[PDB]
Amino acid sequence: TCPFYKKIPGTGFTVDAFQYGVVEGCTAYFLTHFHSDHYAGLSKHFTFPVYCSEITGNLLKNKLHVQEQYIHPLPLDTECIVNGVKVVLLDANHCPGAVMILFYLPNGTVILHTGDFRADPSMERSLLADQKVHMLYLDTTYCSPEYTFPSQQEVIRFAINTAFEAVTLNPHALVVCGTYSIGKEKVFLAIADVLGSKVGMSQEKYKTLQCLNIPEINSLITTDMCSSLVHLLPMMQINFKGLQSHLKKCGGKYNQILAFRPTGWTHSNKFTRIADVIPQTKGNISIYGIPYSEHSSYLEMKRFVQWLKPQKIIPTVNVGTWKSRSTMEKYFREWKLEAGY
Ligand code: NI
């Protein structure tokens, strides 16, 4: 049955709640972003209204075959009215099409659901600046102080410099990047741009990327693996057996693979700067795990909440153990005492 933290009090709304069948008293189902833990349960047979971004709606139509008449895309940064309640969709700095949702309840309560997000100071100048928030449904994925990671920009610098150096030393090397859902596209697109190549991939993944509006995408991506020296593969195939096999498939066009696995976090971060990261190597295959996160670090999350000053925080991640829940609640108290709200 539907958890309380997916239900918006005083409305008929739910958020990311499609795996529970027909939710009692739900008149409209919101979807924050196109990741499988959030959309689990949508299909061509769904006949309730779905509210989402333009990008997420392109993905619903094209990949899951949801019928057009049930998809209700909304523009960002725009006040809209849904079943008589004012709503606003805000950029979540997660994956393409990911949003936060602001709900303005008929009684005066204002609710922010972050969906999945990576908090950033740019958010402190959207429609959030203009009013108070009573309840915050918060993406608490990395809500512990051990989770520090670099900026996205520093990580992309590291990847571009590493790939450019490797291919300049050996023009017969291949670069591979792992993927398992939309998000983290900058990794592979920035590498391709510096090498003057397109990114080669499966027709299924190419279709997925064409759903996203990204400007100049016919320019960066392709299904012709032959013409490409950056290849995208399923994350599961990013290991020595998987990559030896792929290399066999390229018919002696290449003699070396350099592969990247963008991960959320790895405990190497507790003891290492980005500048200091090294690969795992076996034969002519090297694998780099890079800390490219699309979720807030602990410090970024803390800053967001101390700026917003919500009256109540409802975590949406790590809620399944008493120890995790208690840990998070202790941090929320610290943050409030330290900021004076
Ligand atoms: Ni997500």
User: How far does the centroid of ligand 1 lie from the alpha carbon of residue 295, in Å?
Assistant: 8
Provide the experimental method for this PDB entry: X-ray
Residues with Cβ within 5 Å of ion ligand 1? Answer: 35, 116
Could you give all domains of the chain from N- to C-terminal order, each with its CATH number?
Answer: 1-147+296-341 (3.60.15.10), 148-295 (3.40.50.12650)
Strand partners, 137: 113, 314
Among 85, 78, 72, 60, smallest CA distance to 9 is for 85
Pairing of strands 85-91, 99-104: antiparallel
Measured in Å, residue 339 CA sits from the centre of ligand 1 at 29
Q: Encoding tokens for residue 131?
A: 């009013």
Task: Give the tokens for residue 323.
Answer: 């120890």
Q: Are 303 and 336 in contact (CB under 8 A)?
A: no
Q: What is the DSSP string of 33-75?
A: ---HHHHTT--TT--S-EEEEHHHHHHHHHHS---GGGEEEE-
Please give the distance, rounded to the nearest whole angstrom, from the Cα atom of residue 34 to the centre of ligand 1: 8
CA distance 16 to 46: 14
CA of 116 to the centre of ligand 1 (A): 5
Nearest Cα to 311, choosing from 174, 78, 132, 93?
132
Please tell me what DSSP assigns to residue 170. -
CA–centroid distance, 108 to ligand 1, in Å, is 30
What is the SS3 assignment for 272?
coil
Position of tokens 């409209």? 28
Q: How far apart are CA 170 and CA 256, in angstroms?
A: 8
Q: In the beta sheet, which residues pair with residue 286?
A: 258, 281
Tell me the resolution in Å: 1.6
- What is the radius of gyration, based on Cα positions, of the chain? 22
**Of all helices (H) and strands (E), which one includes residue 26?**
none
Distance of alpha carbon 244 from alpha carbon 237, whole angstroms: 10
How many H-runs (helices) and E-runs (strands) does the chain carry? 9, 17
Q: What is the DSSP letter of 225?
A: G
Nearest to 206 by CA among 222, 193, 225: 222
Q: Which residue has the tokens 């000053």?
A: 309
d(CA 165, CA 217): 25
Bridge partners (DSSP) of residue 101 are 89, 113
What is the C-alpha separation between 151 and 119, in angstroms, rounded? 12
Beta strand extents in the chain (DSSP E only):
13-15, 28-30, 50-53, 71-74, 80-82, 85-91, 99-104, 110-113, 135-138, 173-179, 199-200, 221-222, 230-234, 256-262, 280-282, 285-290, 312-315
CA of 160 to the centre of ligand 1 (A): 25
Of residues 228, 287, 297, 230, the one with CA closest to residue 261 = 287
Identify any residues that bridge with 260 across adjacent strands, giving them in sequence order.
Answer: 177, 288
d(CA 62, CA 204): 11
Report residue 160 CA to chain centroid gap. 21
Distance 182 CA to ligand 1 centre (A): 9
Retrieve residue 88's tokens: 């606003």
